[PDB]
Amino acid sequence: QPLSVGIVGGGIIGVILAAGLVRRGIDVKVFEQARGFREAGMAFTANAVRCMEMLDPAIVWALRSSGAVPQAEARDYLRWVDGYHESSKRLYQLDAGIRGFEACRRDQFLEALVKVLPEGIVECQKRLQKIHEKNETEKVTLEFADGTFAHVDCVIGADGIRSRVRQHLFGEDSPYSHPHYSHKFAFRGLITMENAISALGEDKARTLNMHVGPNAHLIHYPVANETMVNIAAFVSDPEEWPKLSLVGPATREEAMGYFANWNPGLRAVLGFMPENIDRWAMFDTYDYPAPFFSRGKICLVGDAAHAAVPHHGAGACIGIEDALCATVLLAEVFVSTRGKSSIVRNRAIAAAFGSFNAVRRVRAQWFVDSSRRVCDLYQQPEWADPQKRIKAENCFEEIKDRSHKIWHFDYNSMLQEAIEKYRHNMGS
Amino acid sequence: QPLSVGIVGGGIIGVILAAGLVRRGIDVKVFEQARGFREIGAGMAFTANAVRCMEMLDPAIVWALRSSGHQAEARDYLRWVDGYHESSKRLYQLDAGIRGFEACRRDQFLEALVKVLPEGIVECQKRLQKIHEKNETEKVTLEFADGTFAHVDCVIGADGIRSRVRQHLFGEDSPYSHPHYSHKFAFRGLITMENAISALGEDKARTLNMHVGPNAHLIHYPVANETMVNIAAFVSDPEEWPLSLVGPATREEAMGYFANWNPGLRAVLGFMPENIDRWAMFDTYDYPAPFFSRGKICLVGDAAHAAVPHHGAGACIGIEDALCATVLLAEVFVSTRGKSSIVRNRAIAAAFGSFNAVRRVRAQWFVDSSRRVCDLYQQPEWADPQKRIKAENCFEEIKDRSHKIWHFDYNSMLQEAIEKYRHNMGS
Numbered sequence: 080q081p082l083s084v085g086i087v088g089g090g091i092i093g094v095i096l097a098a099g100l101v102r103r104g105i106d107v108k109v110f111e112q113a114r115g116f117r118e119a120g121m122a123f124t125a126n127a128v129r130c131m132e133m134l135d136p137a138i139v140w141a142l143r144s145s146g147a148v149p150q151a152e153a154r155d156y157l158r159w160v161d162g163y164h165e166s167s168k169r170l171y172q173l174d175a176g177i178r179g180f181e182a183c184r185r186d187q188f189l190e191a192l193v194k195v196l197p198e199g200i201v202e203c204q205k206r207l208q209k210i211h212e213k214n215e216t217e218k219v220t221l222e223f224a225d226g227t228f229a230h231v232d233c234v235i236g237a238d239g240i241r242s243r244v245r246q247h248l249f250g251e252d253s254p255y256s257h258p259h260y261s262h263k264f265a266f267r268g269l270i271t272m273e274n275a276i277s278a279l280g281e282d283k284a285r286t287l288n289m290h291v292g293p294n295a296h297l298i299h300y301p302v303a304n305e306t307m308v309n310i311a312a313f314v315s316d317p318e319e320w321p322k323l324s325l326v327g328p329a330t331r332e333e334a335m336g337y338f339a340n341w342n343p344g345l346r347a348v349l350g351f352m353p354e355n356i357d358r359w360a361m362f363d364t365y366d367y368p369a370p371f372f373s374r375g376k377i378c379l380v381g382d383a384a385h386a387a388v389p390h391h392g393a394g395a396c397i398g399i400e401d402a403l404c405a406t407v408l409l410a411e412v413f414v415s416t417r418g419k420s421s422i423v424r425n426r427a428i429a430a431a432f433g434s435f436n437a438v439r440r441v442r443a444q445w446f447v448d449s450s451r452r453v454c455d456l457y458q459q460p461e462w463a464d465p466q467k468r469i470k471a472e473n474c475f476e477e478i479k480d481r482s483h484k485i486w487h488f489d490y491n492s493m494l495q496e497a498i499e500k501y502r503h504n505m506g507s
Numbered sequence: 508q509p510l511s512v513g514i515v516g517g518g519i520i521g522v523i524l525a526a527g528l529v530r531r532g533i534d535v536k537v538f539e540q541a542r543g544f545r546e547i548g549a550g551m552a553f554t555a556n557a558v559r560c561m562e563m564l565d566p567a568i569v570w571a572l573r574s575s576g577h578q579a580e581a582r583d584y585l586r587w588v589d590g591y592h593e594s595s596k597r598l599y600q601l602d603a604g605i606r607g608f609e610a611c612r613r614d615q616f617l618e619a620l621v622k623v624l625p626e627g628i629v630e631c632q633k634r635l636q637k638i639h640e641k642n643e644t645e646k647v648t649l650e651f652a653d654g655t656f657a658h659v660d661c662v663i664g665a666d667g668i669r670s671r672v673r674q675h676l677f678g679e680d681s682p683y684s685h686p687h688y689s690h691k692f693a694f695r696g697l698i699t700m701e702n703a704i705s706a707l708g709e710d711k712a713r714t715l716n717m718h719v720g721p722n723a724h725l726i727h728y729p730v731a732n733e734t735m736v737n738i739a740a741f742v743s744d745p746e747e748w749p750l751s752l753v754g755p756a757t758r759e760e761a762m763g764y765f766a767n768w769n770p771g772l773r774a775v776l777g778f779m780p781e782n783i784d785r786w787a788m789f790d791t792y793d794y795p796a797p798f799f800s801r802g803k804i805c806l807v808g809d810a811a812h813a814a815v816p817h818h819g820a821g822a823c824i825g826i827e828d829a830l831c832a833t834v835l836l837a838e839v840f841v842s843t844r845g846k847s848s849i850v851r852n853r854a855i856a857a858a859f860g861s862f863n864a865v866r867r868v869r870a871q872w873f874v875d876s877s878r879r880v881c882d883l884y885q886q887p888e889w890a891d892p893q894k895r896i897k898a899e900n901c902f903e904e905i906k907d908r909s910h911k912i913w914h915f916d917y918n919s920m921l922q923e924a925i926e927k928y929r930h931n932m933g934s
C-alpha cells in the first residue's frame with residue numbers, strides 16, 4: 080500500500096507539509112480544529128521560498144498570487160532607527176537582496192494553498208483530544224473531540240504554539256507541554272499612509288523600520304500597496320499573564336503611555352491609530368524547549384516544536400525547513416522500503432523521525448533563543464542614555480550575524496545529513 | 508497578465524519542461540507531431556543528479572518515474588569487460604551508489620507524465636512547419652502542417668535530433684541545422700536470461716557490462732525483471748549513411764563484425780532472434796550549434812545537443828536544460844509583473860540569452876565526450892597485446908568524464924543563470 084500521514088493542525092506549516100507530501104504520492108490527512116476559518120500578515124526569506132519551491136512549486140505560486148503586485152528592481156532592507164531621541168538618526172541597515180523577503184496575507188495564502196491541494200485532504204472541526212500509540216507495526220490512532228477517530232501510519236504535530244501533540248509527548252502537567260510568557264506584549268494597528276508620511280517622512284513611511292529604545296521598540300511597514308502602514312509596538316510587562324486570552328482589546332492611549340518619552344514622530348504614529356486596537360501577548364518555547372521533537376512515529380513541526388517570539392520575523396521560515404526535512408525523509412522511507420514488510424516500513428518511519436530530531440532541533444531551539452536575544456538588543460535600557468550610545472550601537476554586529484545565520488541556511492546539507500542519519504539508523 | 512510558452516515536441520524533455528512551467532503558473536502548450544506514443548517498450552535510465560533536477564521541476568515527475576519501473580540497499584555499478592581475448596577479465600568498475608541510476612519504461616513514463624499535466628496541454632498531430640517572428644514585442648506565430656496556427660510569447664524547440672526549430676534558427680540548408688553520421692551503427696536485440704547466463708555466467712548476465720575491443724564494443728543488461736537481457740552491439744562503418752536510419756538486420760550480420768572476439772560474447776550474439784534491428788547513430792558533433800537561442804526562440808534537449816549514446820545520459824543533460832529554462836522563465840514571470848509589454852518581451856530574450864551562456868559549453872562538451880568515450884571503448888589497441896597497457900589507462904578518463912556528468916552542480920547553474928539574466932536586463 081502507500082504510507083498514510085496524519086497531520087494535526089491546518090496552519091501554514093501543516094498545509095505546506097501536506098502539499099509537499101501529496102506531490103510525492105504519500106497519503107495525507109490534515110485535521111484542523113477550527114471551522115474552515117482563518118479568523119494578519121507574514122513574511123518569508125528568499126531561502127524559505129526556495130525551500131517552498133522544493134516542496135512543490137505551486138506553493139510559491141500560491142504565495143505570489145495571494146500577495147500584491149509591486150523601473151529597476153528593489154532590494155529588501157531591514158532598517159533600524161533611534162526611537163527615543165529626536166535625533167532619530169538611522170542607526171543600521173541590512174541588505175537582504177532582491178526578493179530577499181516575500182510577503183503575503185496569512186489568510187489569503189492558506190486559502191490558495193488549500194485550493195492547490197487535492198480535495199478532501201483537509202478535515203475541519205477535527206480537534207485532537209488523545210493519541211493512542213501501540214506497537215511500531217500498528218497504526219497510530221487519533222481521537223477527536225466530536226467523538227470521531229482516524230488511523231494513520233504516523234503522526235505530525237503541526238498544531239501550533241499550544242500543540243496538543245506536544246502535551247501527549249511530555250505530559251499535560253509537564254511545563255515542557257506548554258508555552259510560557261516572554262514578559263513582553265504588542266499593540267498592533269494601522270494608519271493611513273498620508274498620516275504615516277505626516278509623522279515620519281515619505282522615506283521612513285514607505286519602508287520597514289524598527290525604532291529602538293529602552294525596554295520597548297516599535298516596528299512598522301507599508302501594506303495594502305503603500306496606502307496603509309502597519310504598526311506593531313512592543314513593550315515590557317514585569318507581571319505574569321493571567322487563562323486570559325493572548326489577544327485582547329486595547330486603546331491607543333494605553334500604547335501612548337509606554338512611549339511617552341519617545342521622540343515626537345514616533346508618538347505621532349501612535350496617536351494616528353484607531354482609538355481601539357489589539358494587545359497580543361508573546362508566548363514561546365524558550366523557557367522549556369522540547370527535549371525531543373520526535374518519539375516513535377510522532378514528530379512535531381513548526382510552532383508545535385519551536386514556537387518563537389516574532390522578533391526575527393522568520394519563525395515560519397524555521398517551520399518551512401522542518402516541512403522540507405520531513406517531506407524528503409518520508410519520501411526516502413516510501414521509496415527505500417517499497418517492497419518490504421510492515422516491520423521494515425514502520426521501523427523506517429521511526430528511523431526517519433529520529434533523523435529529523437537529530438538534524439533540526441539544535442537550529443530550531445537556537446532560533447527560539449535568538450528571537451528573544453535580538454528583542455533584548457532592540458530594547459536595551461542604554462538607548463536612553465546618550466553617553467552609552469557606542470555600547471548600545473555595538474549590538475548590531477551580533478544582530479547581523481544572527482540574521483545571516485537564519486537567511487543563509489544550508490538546506491541542501493541539512494537534507495544530506497538527514498538522509499545519511501536515516502540510513503545509519505536503519506543499520507545501514 | 509500571463510506568459511505563454513510554445514513547446515515544439517512532446518518528448519521526454521518537452522513534456523518535463525512543460526510540467527515545470529505549469530506548476531509555476533505559466534501557460535504552456537506542447538505541440539507534438541505524432542498521433543500517440545512511440546518508443547514502445549524501450550527503457551532509459553537517469554542519474555541521481557537528473558532525478559534531483561526532476562524533483563526541482565515538479566516532485567510529481569519523480570513519482571511518475573517511480574511508478575513506471577529484506578537484505579540491504581543495492582548499489583549501481585558500471586562494469587567493463589574485455590571482449591576481444593579468451594581471458595574476458597573484468598577491466599574496471601565504477602560505483603554510482605545507492606540509486607545512482609533509476610530506470611523506467613520510456614513510453615509508460617511519458618504517459619504517466621501526461622496524466623500529471625492538466626488537460627489540453629499537449630496537442631497531438633501538430634507538426635511544426637514554419638515559424639514566423641515579427642517584432643520582439645509581438646508574439647511568435649507557429650504554422651503547422653495541418654494549416655492551423657498558434658501565437659505564443661516565446662518558443663522552445665524540444666523537437667529532437669531532427670529539430671525543425673533548429674532549421675529555423677540556422678537555415679534549412681545549413682549543415683549546422685542537421686545532425687550527421689558518427690560512422691558507427693548499432694545492432695539491438697534480446698535474448699533469454701537462460702541463454703545469457705550460459706554464455707557469460709550468472710555474474711555477468713544479471714548486470715550491466717560493456718565489452719571493449721577493437722573498432723567495436725558490446726553492452727548488455729537485464730530487462731523484463733531479469734527474464735531477458737538486452738544487447739546493443741556497436742560497430743564501425745567507413746562508408747556514409749545513404750537510406751533510413753533504422754532497418755532490419757540479421758543475427759548473422761552482427762556475428763560477422765565480432766568474428767575474432769571471445770566466445771562468451773560471440774555466443775551472446777548467437778542467441779538473438781534471427782531478425783533484429785540496425786540503428787545509425789547521428790549527432791551534432793560535426794556541426795555544433797553556434798547558439799542555443801535567438802530572440803524569443805530557444806532549443807533544449809536533443810534539438811540543441813543531440814549526442815551519440817555512449818555515456819547513456821543524454822536525457823539527463825536535457826533535464827538540466829529544462830530546469831534552467833523553467834527557473835529562468837519563472838524569474839521573468841515574477842521579475843516583470845506589472846511592467847509593460849515591451850519590458851516583458853525584453854525579459855524573455857534576456858532570459859534566453861542567459862540560458863545560452865550557462866548551458867552551451869557543458870552541453871557541447873557532452874556531445875564530444877560521448878564520441879570520445881566511444882573511441883576509448885573501441886581503441887584498435889585492445890587487440891594488439893603489446894599495447895594493452897596504454898589502452899587500459901583510458902579508464903581514468905572514463906571516470907573523470909563520468910563524474911563530470913554525474914556530479915553536476917546544478918544549484919550553481921541556476922545561480923549563475925539568474926545573475927546573467929539580471930546582467931542582461933541592466934541589473
Ligand SMILES: Cc1cc2nc3c(=O)[nH]c(=O)nc-3n(C[C@H](O)[C@H](O)[C@H](O)COP(=O)(O)OP(=O)(O)OC[C@H]3O[C@@H](n4cnc5c(N)ncnc54)[C@H](O)[C@@H]3O)c2cc1C
Pocket residue numbers: 087088089090091092093110111112113120121122123124205206207208237238239240241242243380381382383389392393394395396397398
Ligand atoms: C505577529 C506575528 C508575526 C509573524 N510574522 C512572521 C513573518 O513575518 N515571517 C515568518 O516567517 N513568520 C512570522 N511569524 C511566525 C508565524 O506566525 C508562525 O511561526 C507560523 O504560523 C507557524 O506555523 P504553524 O502553521 O505551525 O502555526 P499555526 O499557524 O498557529 O498553525 C496551528 C494550526 O493547528 C490548529 N490546531 C491547534 N490545535 C489543534 C488541535 N487540537 N486539533 C487540530 N488542529 C489544531 C490551529 O487551529 C491552527 O490552524 C509571525 C508570528 C506572529 C505571531
Ligand SMILES: Cc1cc2nc3c(=O)[nH]c(=O)nc-3n(C[C@H](O)[C@H](O)[C@H](O)COP(=O)(O)OP(=O)(O)OC[C@H]3O[C@@H](n4cnc5c(N)ncnc54)[C@H](O)[C@@H]3O)c2cc1C
Pocket residue numbers: 515516517518519520521538539540541550551552553633634635636665666667668669670671807808809810816819820821822823824825
Ligand atoms: C539507444 C539510446 C538509448 C538512450 N538511453 C538513455 C538513457 O538511459 N538515459 C538518458 O538520459 N538518455 C538516454 N538516451 C538519450 C535520450 O534518448 C535522448 O537524449 C532524449 O530522448 C532526448 O529527448 P527530447 O525530448 O529532447 O527528444 P525526442 O525524445 O527525440 O523527442 C522529440 C519530440 O519532438 C517531436 N517532433 C519532432 N519534430 C517535430 C515537429 N516538427 N513538430 C512537432 N513535434 C516534432 C518528435 O515527434 C518527438 O516526440 C538514449 C538515446 C539512445 C539513442
Ligand SMILES: Cc1cc(O)c(C)c(O)c1C=O
Pocket residue numbers: 122157180298311389390391392393
Ligand atoms: C522581516 C520581519 C517581519 C516582521 O513582522 C517583524 C516583526 C520583524 O521583526 C522582521 C525582521 O526583523
Ligand SMILES: Cc1cc(O)c(C)c(O)c1C=O
Pocket residue numbers: 133407491492494495498559562
Ligand atoms: C539528499 C537530497 C535529497 C533530495 O531529494 C533533494 C531535494 C536534495 O537536494 C538532497 C540534497 O542533498
Ligand SMILES: Cc1cc(O)c(C)c(O)c1C=O
Pocket residue numbers: 552582583584585608609610715
Ligand atoms: C536501474 C539501473 C540503470 C542503470 O543504467 C545502471 C547502470 C544500473 O546499475 C541500474 C541499477 O543497478
Ligand SMILES: [Cl-]
Pocket residue numbers: 387388389390391392393394395
Ligand atoms: Cl517569527
Ligand SMILES: [Cl-]
Pocket residue numbers: 814815816817818819820821822
Ligand atoms: Cl545518451
